């Protein structure tokens, strides 16, 4: 027959702090046992306050990002303001569900700030079930990224650690570390790591090289 889907890899990670949000991904686009390109970052600026990360079928991720872009403009002409992080996350849920019977093979994670300036992260499934959380990973290597974050950020399975609040510095290294680990095991993760930091000042991008095999 004919399959409307392809698997292109990519893992996306988001973490929430007091006044910052982090969205990070690998730069590898692949298909089968071949790499399409080594220069495909999954982070995308939507507003100064909100950044998206899409992974899975790149055809769906591209069209979906363009839908969101158009929908962002539609909102602002109609409402006279920018669509907030929580509003974008709510809108994304509905867009994904309108395709409940022909879904976007897509893993979306939303990172930004809420109306109080506090860090916000939204994790989605291919069909639009979502919630807010402190940290979440989506994509081919999400199961590799999750447990380490559960232990270190959530302080899970530990007895007398004093429970230190999350700092930008510490989260940055944490983001770097989990991807370094995943690139060693997941064949779909590698090349380079791009981190997008959302703060009150705006969006700053940072690049750290990864395994290229």
């Amino acid at each position: 027959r004919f399959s409307p889907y392809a698997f292109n890899g990519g893992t996306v990670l988001a973490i929430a702090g007091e006044d910052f949000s982090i969205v990070a991904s690998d730069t590898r686009l692949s298909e089968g046992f071949s790499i399409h390109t080594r220069d495909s970052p999954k982070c995308y600026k939507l507003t100064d306050k909100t950044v998206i990360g899409c992974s899975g079928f790149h055809g769906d991720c591209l069209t979906l990002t363009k839908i969101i872009e158009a929908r962002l403009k539609m909102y602002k002409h109609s409402n006279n303001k920018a669509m907030t992080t929580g509003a974008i996350a709510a809108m994304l849920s509905t867009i994904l569900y309108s395709r409940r019977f022909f879904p976007y093979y897509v893993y979306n994670i939303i990172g930004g700030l809420d109306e109080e300036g506090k860090g916000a992260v939204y994790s989605f499934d291919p069909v639009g079930s979502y919630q807010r959380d402190s940290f979440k990973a989506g994509g081919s290597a999400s199961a590799m990224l999750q447990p380490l974050l559960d232990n270190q950020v959530g302080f899970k399975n530990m007895q007398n650690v004093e429970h230190v609040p999350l700092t930008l510095d510490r989260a940055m290294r944490l983001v770097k570390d989990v991807f370094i680990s995943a690139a060693e095991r997941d064949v779909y993760t590698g090349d380079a790591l791009r981190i997008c930091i959302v703060t009150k000042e705006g969006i700053r991008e940072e690049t750290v090289p990864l395994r290229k095999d």
């Binding site: 849920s93 509905t94 994904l96 569900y97 409940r100 019977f101 994790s123 499934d125 069909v127 639009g128 079930s129 979502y130 919630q131 959380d133 979440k136 199961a143």
Partner: protein, 201 residues
């Protein structure tokens, strides 16, 4: 999921787990499975996550319109019936949703179970999810109409916690509500495994 709700002399209590599973993998362990529609309506969630979220929010959307139109708030019977009808429009299309509707109208305390099939029944007790059979066992062994708020909190807590011990797909925390004459009040968000150790003396 595991989900439970029962009514007694002092209203209705509602308890759910918080685990979200994709295949054999735990995607979320802090997943909210109760939707607070109005100050005195309550909806639980079980099955396909996105199906539950969307459709019970769509019920909530309509319970909002009803109050703004009629100016008198919506009954429990009406709400659960409206959801059943939404489910019936999408027949044999693969929606997976099991929900219980809780509230207080003039008829008193209202408890309802609604299926993705369209099934809708009123009763004193219900349990949905992969761990409903375990939740039922501990519920029935230790239920009486003459429960006190503290006894009922003990039972609903116990029922989820024990279900999550046996059910591969239940875990996280117990989230419990007490439906009182003047609306629900959220009782607790207690860790499941912490309780299981407490119950083990």
């Amino acid at each position: 999921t595991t989900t439970l709700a029962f009514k007694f002399q002092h209203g209705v209590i509602v308890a759910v787990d918080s685990r979200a599973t994709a295949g054999s993998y735990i995607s979320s362990l802090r997943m909210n499975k109760v939707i607070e529609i109005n100050p005195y309506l309550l909806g639980t969630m079980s099955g396909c996550a996105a199906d539950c979220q969307y459709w019970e929010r769509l019920l909530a959307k309509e319970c909002r319109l009803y109050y703004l139109r009629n100016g008198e708030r919506i009954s429990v019977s009406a709400a659960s019936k409206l959801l059943s009808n939404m489910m019936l429009q999408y027949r044999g299309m693969g929606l997976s949703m099991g929900s219980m509707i809780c509230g207080w109208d003039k008829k008193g305390p209202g408890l309802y179970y609604v299926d993705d099939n369209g099934t809708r029944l009123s009763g004193q007790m219900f349990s949905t999810g992969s761990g409903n059979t375990y939740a039922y066992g501990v519920m029935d062994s230790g239920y009486r109409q003459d429960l006190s708020p503290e006894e009922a909190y003990d039972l609903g807590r116990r029922a989820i916690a024990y279900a999550t011990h046996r059910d591969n797909y239940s875990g996280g925390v117990v989230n419990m509500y007490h439906m009182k004459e003047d609306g629900w009040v959220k009782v607790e968000s207690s860790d499941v495994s912490d309780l299981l150790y407490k119950y083990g003396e």
